[PDB]
Structure 1
Amino acid sequence: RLIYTAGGYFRQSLSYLEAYNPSDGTWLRLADLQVPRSGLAGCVVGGLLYAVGGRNNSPDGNTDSSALDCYNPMTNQWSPCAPMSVPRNRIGVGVIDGHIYAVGGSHGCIHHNSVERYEPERDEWHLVAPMLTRRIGVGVAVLNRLLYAVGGFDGTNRLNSAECYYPERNEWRMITAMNTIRSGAGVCVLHNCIYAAGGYDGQDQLNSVERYDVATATWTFVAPMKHRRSALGITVHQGRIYVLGGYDGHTFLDSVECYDPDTDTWSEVTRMTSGRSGVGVAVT
């Protein structure tokens, strides 16, 4: 299983698809995206990688993306899928029962609270219940078959608030807010807990990482990342969190740090082939 990273931004939105293998520490250069994009999210359903939303920030202009594109690792080929109801830049994404949930993001000045679900078997999007809070740069995590939306930006303020979606009931509920305000953090699930890593608090890029425990309903801090970052990629591979690139306030990072929950330590495991922010990431 590899860590796939799609798109991102350095001077302009990028078309890269690359895969890191933690076994031998090597990088694979795979087929480019058909359209360049940053602020996208990545996910896996049935062994196929999906690139969702984002925006093509190029020299000619800015085009927000409603596009869903599917990459098959066996064929090294990208294929277009049905587009979302609206463009979603700085989107959040999660998977439940092989269905892709597109959460939040922006289209111009519009900051979405709306959410929609994709069915791969039918190639159809449908709108579900909208979030209680409008969120761009939102972190998404699936835990106990519930879709969590964590942090982000509502149009006016950056958020420490988080909320939880109930697919069977089709409704959202606000949960315990985070210790820190985090827009553009990395949010993932490891060992029955939601991790929120880095992001931007309104003033500074964060290196701090905090962990939601469901039973206690409390966010507690864990060991911080060596390098502060926002608009970072995030994923989990064999019981370790990987964070990929991002923006530190001054430069674009190629750094990849890995978190070991047993030792509560971060270490830099590799570098991306080039520094970038706003990548989509997934594992398969």
Structure 2
Amino acid sequence: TLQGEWMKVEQKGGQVPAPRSSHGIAVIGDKLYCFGGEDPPYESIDNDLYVFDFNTHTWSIAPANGDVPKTRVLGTRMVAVGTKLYVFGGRNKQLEFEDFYSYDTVKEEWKFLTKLDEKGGPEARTFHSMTSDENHVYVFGGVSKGGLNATPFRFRTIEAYNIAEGKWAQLPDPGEDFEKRGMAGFLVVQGKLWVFYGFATANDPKIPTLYGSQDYESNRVHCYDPATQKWTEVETTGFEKPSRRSCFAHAAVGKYIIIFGGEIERDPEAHQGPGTLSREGFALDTETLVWERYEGGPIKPSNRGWVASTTTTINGKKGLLVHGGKLMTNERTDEMYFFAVNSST
């Protein structure tokens, strides 16, 4: 049902960002924005805001005006609403977390919005997921951390920033039966918030450890309806339902949740090695609840995860944009791919 074409996005040159994983991207108009990243493992890279122009196929660095982000971070995320970008969380090797900032793409300046990790306010998070709608920025999951030898934990909550009010609130807690997760899929689809798959903390002491930890790849799917503020678990089906996985590319196009790649087996040494990464794309029809693989012609992106992804439109087609990530060689990549959807959604 979901048909389309994979494309490798040409990058002609300019101030090209070093290869990275664990970073955030978003598009406003004809420009791609890029912030944060990891390379080598556990190491952040820079704090420039990179800008890719889809008309010129070249890179630049956005003017560092206003309240410039204080930390070079990995595990950070970025979304677009209107003409503003929003960056939340991530951390460096020294456990300094990025706070909440907006960037006005028109005036080309940063604004500090929220100090993170204060009592009663949104927490510092890294390897969280983010999405957005007309008047909200949403943050799901990811992992907290005290000090170096602390036992960091995951969130199962959503923090919601009302742009109009300039205020954070936590959405209803889905409760103990809902897995706390980092690097989960998180998207707005036809007016509702969807949480799917990801890397879970166990809520069952009976689940055995792997490499000294119970942590495992989720395959569960939930949706949150702002209209009712209620959570529901969604039973999804299909011969081609994807195996458990995390840190995958994902975007929403109409009724479809579209994913590509991701970690399908844990690395023995956490984020040190690449574990096992998928080279396959799956899409969930949120109406039929059926999963299917998708294919995109002769261009087939190689195994990768920890990519940055977002929804955008290129040459008149909405689809899934994939940038960076780590490869099975354990190297980071600067490659950018776009899956252009051709069929109705």
TM over 0.5: yes
Q: Distance in 2 between matches of 1:41 and 1:176?
A: 28
Structure showing the higher strand proportion among its residues: 1
Could you give the per-residue CA deviations for residues 231-267 of structure 1, whole angstroms, max 9, x where no partner exists? 101122221321000011311011101112229xxxx
Tell me the equivalent position of 2:303.
228
Q: Distance in 1 between matches of 2:279 and 2:192?
A: 27
Corresponding position: 1:48 with 2:84:
yes
Corresponding position: 1:184 with 2:216:
no
Q: Distance in 2 between matches of 1:140 and 1:242?
A: 15
Which amino acid is the alignment partner of residue 93 of structure 1?
M
Which amino acid is the alignment partner of residue 135 of structure 2?
G
Corresponding position: 1:115 with 2:158:
yes
By how many angstroms is 1:62 displaced?
Answer: 2.3
Could you give the per-residue CA deviations for residues 106-155 of structure 1, whole angstroms, max 9, x where no partner exists? 11221111111101222221111124221101121111110111211112
Which residue among 37, 44, 49 is the counterpart of 1:8? 37
Q: Which structure ranks higher in relative contact order (CA pairs < 8 Å, sequence separation ≥ 6)? A: 2
Which residue among 43, 68, 77 is the counterpart of 2:109? 77
Which residue among 190, 194, 197 is the counterpart of 1:148? 194
Which amino acid is the alignment partner of residue 280 of structure 2?
S
Tell me, yes or no, if the aligned pair for 2:100 and 2:114 is still in contact at 8 Å: yes
Which residue among 167, 174, 199 is the counterpart of 1:124? 167
* Structure 2 residues not aligned, in runs of 5+: 1-28, 117-121, 146-151, 202-214, 267-275
Corresponding position: 1:209 with 2:281:
yes
By how many angstroms is 1:48 displaced?
Answer: 0.4
The residue matched to 1:152 in structure 2 has which SS?
strand
Identity of aligned residues (%): 20
Corresponding position: 1:244 with 2:323:
yes
Q: Which stretches of structure 1, 4 residues or longer, exceed 3 Å deviation after superposition? A: 31-34
Q: Distance in 1 between matches of 2:216 and 2:249?
A: 18
Q: Distance in 2 between matches of 1:207 and 1:122?
A: 42
Which amino acid is the alignment partner of residue 163 of structure 1?
H
* Structure 1 residues not aligned, in runs of 5+: 264-284
Could you give the per-residue CA deviations for residues 196-246 of structure 1, whole angstroms, max 9, x where no partner exists? 111101251111111011221111001274221111011222213210000
Q: Distance in 1 between matches of 2:134 and 2:60?
A: 29
Which of structures 1 and 2 has the bigger CA Rg? 2
Could you give the per-residue CA deviations for residues 17-63 of structure 1, whole angstroms, max 9, x where no partner exists? 11222222111211454321211121122310001111123xxx223
Tell me the equivalent position of 1:106.
143
Which amino acid is the alignment partner of residue 43 of structure 1?
V
Which residue among 252, 255, 280 is the counterpart of 2:335? 255
Could you give the per-residue CA deviations for residues 160-181 of structure 1, whole angstroms, max 9, x where no partner exists? 2121111121122112355221
Tell me the equivalent position of 2:130.
93
Return the TM-score normalized by structure 1.
Answer: 0.85
Which amino acid is the alignment partner of residue 183 of structure 1?
S
Could you give the per-residue CA deviations for residues 67-125 of structure 1, whole angstroms, max 9, x where no partner exists? 21111112221111113521111111111331111111111221111111101222221
Q: Distance in 1 between matches of 2:57 and 2:224?
A: 37
The residue matched to 1:140 in structure 2 has which SS?
strand
Which amino acid is the alignment partner of residue 101 of structure 1?
Y
Q: Distance in 1 between matches of 2:284 and 2:190?
A: 13
Tell me the equivalent position of 1:174.
233
Deviates more, 1:254-263 or 1:205-214: 254-263
Tell me, yes or no, if the aligned pair for 2:255 and 2:287 is still in contact at 8 Å: no
Tell me the equivalent position of 1:136.
182
Which amino acid is the alignment partner of residue 115 of structure 1?
I
Q: Distance in 2 between matches of 1:143 and 1:245?
A: 24
